Amino acid sequence: GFGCPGDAYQCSEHCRALGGGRTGGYCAGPWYLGHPTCTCSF
């Protein structure tokens, strides 16, 4: 979700919105499909 898999920028905006301490986020996922899971970074 949040643009991913496909766009990491929307994933980053989603993570930044969850808290300003987060500078962004990256996309990862389960043992199946692509990268649907946004995981946030500081």
Side-chain angles (χ1 to χ4, degrees):
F2 311 109
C4 249
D7 177 35
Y9 178 79
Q10 190 182 128
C11 186
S12 181
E13 287 191 313
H14 162 63
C15 281
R16 291 164 66 88
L18 294 173
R22 295 165 181 97
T23 50
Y26 306 112
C27 313
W31 306 110
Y32 45 82
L33 300 169
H35 307 97
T37 302
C38 273
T39 306
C40 302
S41 191
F42 296 80

